[PDB]
C-alpha cells in the first residue's frame, strides 16, 4: 500500500483521517458509511426499546427515548398519551436498519472499490475545496434536501395523522393541524423574544399551529436559499471574509452544530409542548407546580398561594421560581391575573388531579428522559464548541502558513518594536 | 576492598531499577504498607471498631472498602503485633485495627526512604536535588494528617481511615467540627494547588504553541504574547521553572501548618464580631452565619454514628433543622 | 488610509501596550462593567432577599462583613431566570433588594470571559503562532459557566447560582454536596485527580528543568493536556448534576441474611449529607 | 473588634514593604 503511512502523508496514525483531505472518493465513502452508522443506531435502538416495551408503564417510567420521539409525532398513540400498538415503531426501526445496510454498502464501495478521486472519473463529482462556486452549489443542493424534509414534516402534521397535541381538551390527543400560523408579526415576535426568563427565545412556543407554520416557513426558505446558492456566485466581500478550505468548512459546521446542540438542550428541558410531558415526563417546572397543587388539593380536602412580584396569584414556597409556567393540566384553572383560589376550589377535573400526582412522583433512583437528553447533549455541545475553536484556529493558521511552527530565522516577534 | 565496598558497588550497579542504600529502607517498608492496605480491604473488617462493613468479604464495593482506624479506647497505643493489646494473637490484632497502624507506620518509613532515594540518585547523576526538596511537601502533608492530627486528638480513631469514602468522611468531619474551609492556611493550600495546576496547563500550552518549525520554543514570542495578552510574563526560563516548582510545594506546606493547628483545636472556627452582631439582633444574616448553621447540623447528624463509641443519644427534638 | 481602515489598523495592531483586537472591543466594556459593579456591590450594597421570602441577607462590607464573610448575594428566588435590567425595575431600592447587581455582574463577566478567549486566539494569530492557547483556556471557562450559568438554568433560578464571595463559595459547595453528593460522582474524582496531578507534574517538571539547567515535545504536550482534560470532565460533571443526574449512591447496600442492615462508610457519608440538607430547606 | 487588629495589619503591610523598597532603591542607585 501507498499513502497509508506516516512518511507519505505526514500524519500519525492517531490523525489518520486527516490524510483523507484531498481524496474525494474515499472521503465521500467515509461520510456515507458514517451516515449508515447513524441510521443503524436509530433502527437498532428503536427495535430494542420496542422489544422491551411494557404497555402498562408510562414511557418515561419505562425508560425509552427513541420511542417518545415517535409518540410525539403520533405514530400509534391515542388520546391521553396511550399507545394502541407498537407495530409502527417496529416498522420505522426495520426501515432504518435496511437503509443503514444500503448506506454501509455504498460507503464500502466508495471506500475501496470505486474511484479514489472523483476528479479522475468526472467533474461534477470531482471537487476541490478551494473552488468557491462548487462548494456553494453543493451547499445549495443539500439545503434543498433539508427544505424538502421540513416541508415533509409539515405535510405530515397537516394531512397524515398529525401530531400529538397535548393542548387538546381533556388531556392530550393526536390531532391534525388545520390552521397554521403565517402572520410575520408572530414570527418576528418569536425571534426577537428575549432568550432570558423574559419569555423564551424559540423554546417558548406553546401551540402546534406555530410549530407547523414555522416548519412551513423554514422549508420554503431552505428551498429558496438552495436555489439561490446554485444560481449565484459568492460576492467579493464574502470571498474576502472567509477561509476557503476543507477544515474551515468543517469548523463552520462545528460552530453551527454547537449552537444547535445548546438550543436542543433548551427545548428538551423547558418545553412541554413539542416534548409532551405524557411521554418524556414532567419538566422541572411542571413537577414543582404539580407537587404544590397536589399538596393544596390535600389541604383543601382536609379543611397555599401568594402574590407574584407583579401581583398575580401564584403558588408559594420554592415553586415561586416557576410562577409563569404554563401547562395543559393547569391551564384550565387560570385567570386574568394568575390562578384564582375560587377556581381551585371547585374546578379540578379528575384527570388533572391524577396528572398532578403522577407528575409529583416523577420529578426529574429515577432519571427522566429529559435528564438523559439534556446532560448528554450539553456535553456534546460543549465538546463541539471546543472542536469548533480547534478547527477554526487550525484553518486560519494553515491558510496563513505558520501552522507547523514558528520559523527560526524569520520569526515575526523578533522584528516588532519593544513596548518598553 | 572490604565487604562494605563490595556491598556498596553491588547496590549502585545498574539494573532494571536502582536500589541504592535507600532501597533497604524503601522497598520493604513500601511493600509492607501496600500489602497491609490490600489485606485490610480484602479480608479484615471494621465491625468491632466502627461497627461497619468495610471489607470485600462483608460485600463492600471498591469505593467503600477501608482499612479503618483502631478503636477509640486504645488511645494512641502503637498496637504492636506483640504488644499488651494484641499479645501475639493475629486475629485480635486485626480486629482491633492494628492494620491501620501497620500501614501508616510503614508508609511513613517508605516516604522517608523515597526522599533518601531521591537524594542518592541526584548524588549519583550529579545534579541539584531539587526533586527531594519538592518531595518534602508531600511528606509534610502525610506527617501532618496521619500522625500529628490523630496524636493531637483523643485517639487514632480520628485519623483518616485508608480508603475512598472513609477519606470523604474525614473531609466532611473536618468541615463539621473544625470548619477547615475558613482556615487561612487551608486557603493558601488551595491557592497553591490550583495555581500549580494553572501553571502546568498554561506552560504546556505555551510551549506547544510557540514551537519552532524544525531549548526548542520561541521564548521571545511567548514573552510578547503573554505581556500583551495578560500584562506580565516570565522573561527568564530558570525563574519560570523554579516558580513552577515553588508554588505547589508552598501550598502544601501552608496546608500542613493549617492541619497541625486544627490538630490542637487551635482552629479558626468563627469571627467574634459576627457572632456578637448576630446575638444582638436576629435579622442580621450573612453567608458565614449560615455556614455556622450547616456546621451545627452536620455535627448533630453525624456524631451519633461517626463516634459510635461515645454512645451519643440525641433525640429528634434536639437535632437542628430548618423548621 | 480610509478612516475606517485607520481605525482597524489601530485596534488590530501589535504596538499597543495591551492588545485590543475585535474580541477585545467587546471584552473591555463588559469586563469594566463587571469589575465596577462588583467593587461597588461588594463594598456597599443592601441586604438581598435571597430566599424570596421578604427576609433579607446582607453581604457587603459596610453592612458588617469582612473579606472572608462578605459576598455579592445571588438574585432573589422570586425573579427566577428573568433578566432584571435596571430600567425594568419598579424602584432602584427594590431592584437592589431583589439582587440585580449579581445578575449584572455575572452576565457581563461571562460575556467578557468568552470574548477574552477569543482575544487570546486573535493575538496568537496576529503574532504567527499555533492558535491553541484558547483551547487550553476553555477549561476554566467551562467551569465558571457551569457554576454561574448552567447550574441555575438546570435549577430554574439564579438563586441557586454561586455567590460572589469567599464564604459564599463554601456555602455553595456544602449545599451542592448535600443535594447532589458530588464527592461520589466520578467526574469530580477526575477533577480532583486533575488538579492534584497537575500540581505533581508541575513540581516534577520544574524540579527537573531547574536541576539540570544549572519525544521531549510530547512531555510538554502532556503537561498542557492533563489538567485541561480533567477540568473539562469535572465541569461536565457539574453540568450533569445541574439536571438532577446525581452521582453514585451506595446507601443501604449490605443487608444481614435475616434482614438487618449493616452500615458502611457510604451510610455515614449519607447521614452527613442528611445533616447538611435538613439544615438547608428552611421549610417543607 | 480587636483594637490591635488594625495595628497588626498595618505593621504586617508596612515592615516587609519598606524592607523590599529599601533593597530595590539601594540596588537601583548602584549601576
Amino acid at each position: 500500500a501507498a499513502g497509508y503511512d506516516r512518511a507519505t502523508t505526514g500524519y500519525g496514525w492517531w490523525a489518520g483521517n486527516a490524510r483523507l483531505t484531498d481524496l474525494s472518493g474515499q472521503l465521500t465513502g467515509a461520510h456515507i458509511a458514517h451516515a449508515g452508522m447513524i441510521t443503524f443506531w436509530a433502527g437498532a435502538m428503536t427495535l430494542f426499546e420496542v422489544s422491551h416495551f411494557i404497555p402498562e408503564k408510562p414511557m418515561y417510567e419505562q425508560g425509552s427515548i427513541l420511542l417518545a420521539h415517535l409518540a410525539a409525532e403520533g405514530f400509534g398513540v391515542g388520546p391521553g398519551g396511550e399507545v394502541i400498538s407498537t407495530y409502527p415503531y417496529f416498522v420505522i426501526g426495520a426501515i432504518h436498519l435496511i437503509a443503514s445496510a444500503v448506506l454501509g454498502f455504498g460507503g464500502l464501495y466508495h471506500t475501496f472499490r470505486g474511484p479514489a478521486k472523483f476528479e479522475d472519473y468526472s467533474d461534477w463529482w470531482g471537487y476541490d475545496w478551494e473552488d468557491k462556486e462548487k462548494m456553494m452549489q453543493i451547499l445549495g443542493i443539500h439545503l434543498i434536501f433539508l427544505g424538502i424534509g421540513a416541508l415533509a414534516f409539515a405535510a405530515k402534521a397537516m394531512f397524515f395523522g398529525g401530531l400529538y397535541d397535548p393542548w387538546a381538551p381533556g388531556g392530550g390527543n393526536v390531532r391534525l393541524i388545520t390552521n397554521p400560523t403565517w402572520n410575520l408579526g408572530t414570527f418576528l415576535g418569536y425571534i426577537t423574544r428575549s432568550p432570558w426568563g423574559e419569555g423564551g427565545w424559540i423554546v417558548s412556543v406553546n401551540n402546534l399551529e406555530d410549530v407547523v407554520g414555522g416548519h412551513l416557513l423554514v422549508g420554503v426558505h431552505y428551498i429558496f436559499g438552495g436555489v439561490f446558492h446554485i444560481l449565484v456566485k459568492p460576492w467579493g466581500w464574502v470571498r474576502r471574509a472567509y477561509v476557503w478550505s476543507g477544515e474551515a468548512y468543517l469548523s463552520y459546521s462545528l460552530g453551527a452544530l454547537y449552537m444547535c446542540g445548546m438550543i436542543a438542550v433548551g427545548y428538551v428541558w423547558f418545553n412541554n409542548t413539542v416534548y409532551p410531558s405524557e411521554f418524556y415526563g414532567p419538566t422541572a417546572a411542571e413537577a414543582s407546580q404539580a407537587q404544590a397543587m397536589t399538596f393544596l388539593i390535600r389541604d383543601q380536602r382536609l379543611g397555599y398561594l401568594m402574590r407574584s412580584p407583579s401581583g398575580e396569584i401564584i403558588f408559594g414556597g420554592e415553586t415561586m421560581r416557576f410562577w409563569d409556567f404554563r401547562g395543559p393540566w393547569l391551564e384550565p384553572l387560570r385567570g386574568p391575573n394568575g390562578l384564582d383560589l375560587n377556581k381551585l376550589r371547585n374546578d379540578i377535573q379528575p384527570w388533572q388531579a391524577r396528572r398532578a400526582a403522577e407528575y409529583m412522583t416523577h420529578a426529574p433512583n429515577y432519571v427522566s428522559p429529559r435528564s438523559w437528553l439534556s446532560t448528554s447533549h450539553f456535553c456534546l455541545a460543549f465538546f463541539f464548541f471546543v472542536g469548533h475553536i480547534w478547527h477554526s484556529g487550525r484553518a486560519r493558521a494553515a491558510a496563513a502558513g505558520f501552522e507547523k511552527g514558528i520559523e527560526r530565522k524569520t520569526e515575526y516577534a523578533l522584528s516588532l518594536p519593544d513596548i518598553d | 576492598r572490604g565487604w562494605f565496598d563490595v556491598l556498596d558497588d553491588w547496590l549502585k550497579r545498574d539494573r532494571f531499577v536502582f536500589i541504592g542504600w535507600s532501597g533497604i529502607l524503601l522497598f520493604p517498608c513500601a511493600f509492607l504498607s501496600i500489602g497491609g492496605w490490600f489485606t485490610g480491604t480484602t479480608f479484615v473488617t471494621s465491625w468491632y471498631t466502627h461497627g461497619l462493613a468495610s471489607s470485600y468479604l462483608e460485600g463492600a464495593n471498591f469505593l467503600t472498602v477501608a482499612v479503618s482506624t483502631p478503636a477509640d479506647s486504645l488511645g494512641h497505643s502503637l498496637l504492636l503485633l506483640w504488644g499488651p493489646e494484641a499479645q501475639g494473637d493475629f486475629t485480635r490484632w486485626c480486629q482491633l485495627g492494628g492494620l491501620w497502624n501497620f500501614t501508616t507506620l510503614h508508609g511513613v518509613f517508605g516516604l522517608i526512604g523515597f526522599m533518601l532515594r531521591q537524594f542518592e540518585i541526584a548524588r549519583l547523576v550529579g545534579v541539584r536535588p531539587y526533586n527531594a526538596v519538592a518531595f518534602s511537601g508531600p511528606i509534610a502533608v502525610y506527617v501532618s494528617v496521619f500522625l500529628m492530627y490523630p496524636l493531637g486528638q483523643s485517639s487514632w480513631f480520628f485519623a483518616p481511615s485508608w480508603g475512598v469514602t472513609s477519606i470523604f468522611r474525614f473531609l466532611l468531619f473536618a468541615q463539621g467540627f473544625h470548619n477547615l474551609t475558613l482556615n487561612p492556611f487551608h486557603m493558601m493550600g488551595v491557592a497553591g494547588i490550583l495555581g500549580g495546576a494553572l501553571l502546568c496547563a498554561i506552560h504546556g500550552a505555551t510551549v506547544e504553541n510557540t514551537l519552532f518549525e524544525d531549548e526548542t520554543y520561541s521564548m521571545v514570542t511567548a514573552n510578547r504574547f503573554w505581556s500583551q495578552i495578560f500584562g506580565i510574563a516570565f522573561s527568564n526560563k530558570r525563574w519560570l521553572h523554579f516558580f513552577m516548582l515553588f508554588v505547589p510545594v508552598t501550598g502544601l506546606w501552608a496546608s500542613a501548618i493549617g492541619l497541625v493547628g486544627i490538630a490542637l483545636n487551635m482552629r479558626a472556627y468563627d469571627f467574634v464580631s459576627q457572632e456578637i452582631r448576630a446575638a444582638e439582633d436576629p435579622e442580621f444574616e450573612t453567608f458565614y452565619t449560615k455556614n455556622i448553621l450547616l456546621n451545627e447540623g452536620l455535627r448533630a447528624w453525624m456524631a451519633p454514628q461517626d463516634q459510635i463509641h461515645e454512645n451519643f443519644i440525641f433525640p429528634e427534638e434536639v437535632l437542628p433543622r430548618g423548621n | 488610509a480610509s478612516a475606517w481602515e485607520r481605525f482597524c489598523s489601530f485596534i488590530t495592531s501589535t504596538n499597543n501596550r495591551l492588545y485590543i483586537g475585535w474580541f477585545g472591543v467587546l471584552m473591555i466594556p463588559t469586563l469594566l462593567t463587571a469589575v465596577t459593579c462588583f467593587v461597588i456591590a461588594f463594598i456597599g450594597a443592601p441586604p438581598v432577599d435571597i430566599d424570596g421570602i421578604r427576609e433579607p441577607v446582607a453581604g457587603s462590607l459596610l453592612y458588617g462583613n469582612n473579606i472572608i464573610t462578605g459576598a455579592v448575594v445571588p438574585s432573589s428566588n422570586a425573579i427566577g431566570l428573568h433578566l432584571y435590567p435596571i430600567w425594568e425595575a419598579a424602584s432602584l431600592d427594590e431592584w437592589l433588594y431583589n439582587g440585580g447587581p449579581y445578575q449584572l455582574i455575572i452576565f457581563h463577566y461571562m460575556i467578557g470571559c468568552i470574548c477574552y478567549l477569543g482575544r487570546q486566539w486573535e493575538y496568537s494569530y496576529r503574532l504567527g503562532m499555533r492558535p491553541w492557547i484558547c483551547v487550553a483556556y476553555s477549561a476554566p471557562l467551562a467551569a465558571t459557566y457551569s457554576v454561574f450559568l448552567i447550574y441555575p438554568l438546570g435549577q430554574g433560578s439564579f438563586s441557586d447560582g454561586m455567590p460572589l464571595g469567599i464564604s459564599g463559595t463554601f456555602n455553595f459547595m456544602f449545599v451542592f454536596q448535600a443535594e447532589h453528593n458530588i464527592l461520589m460522582h466520578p467526574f469530580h474524582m477526575f477533577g480532583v485527580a486533575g488538579v492534584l496531578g497537575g500540581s505533581l507534574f508541575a513540581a516534577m517538571h520544574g524540579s527537573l528543568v531547574s536541576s539540570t539547567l544549572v519525544n521531549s515535545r510530547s512531555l510538554h504536550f502532556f503537561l498542557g493536556a492533563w489538567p485541561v482534560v480533567c477540568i473539562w470532565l469535572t465541569a461536565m460533571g457539574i453540568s450533569t448534576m445541574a439536571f438532577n443526574l446525581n452521582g453514585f449512591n451506595f446507601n443501604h447496600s449490605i443487608v444481614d441474611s435475616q434482614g438487618n442492615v449493616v452500615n458502611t462508610w457510604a451510610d455515614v457519608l449519607n447521614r452527613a449529607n442528611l445533616g447538611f440538607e435538613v439544615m438547608h430547606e428552611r421549610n417543607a | 473588634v480587636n483594637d490591635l487588629g488594625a495595628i497588626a495589619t498595618a505593621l504586617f503591610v508596612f515592615i516587609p514593604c519598606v524592607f523590599l523598597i529599601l533593597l530595590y532603591a539601594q540596588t537601583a542607585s548602584r549601576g
Binding site: 518598553d420 | - | - | 487588629g5 503591610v13
Partner: peptide, 28 residues
Amino acid sequence: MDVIAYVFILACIIGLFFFAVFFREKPT
C-alpha cells in the same frame, strides 16, 4: 474602621498592578 483597612490594601494592590504593567523594566 476595618473597611478602611481592607479598602486601603485593595487600592495598594491595584496601584501595584498599574505599576507592574506599565513600568516594568524592559526584558532583554
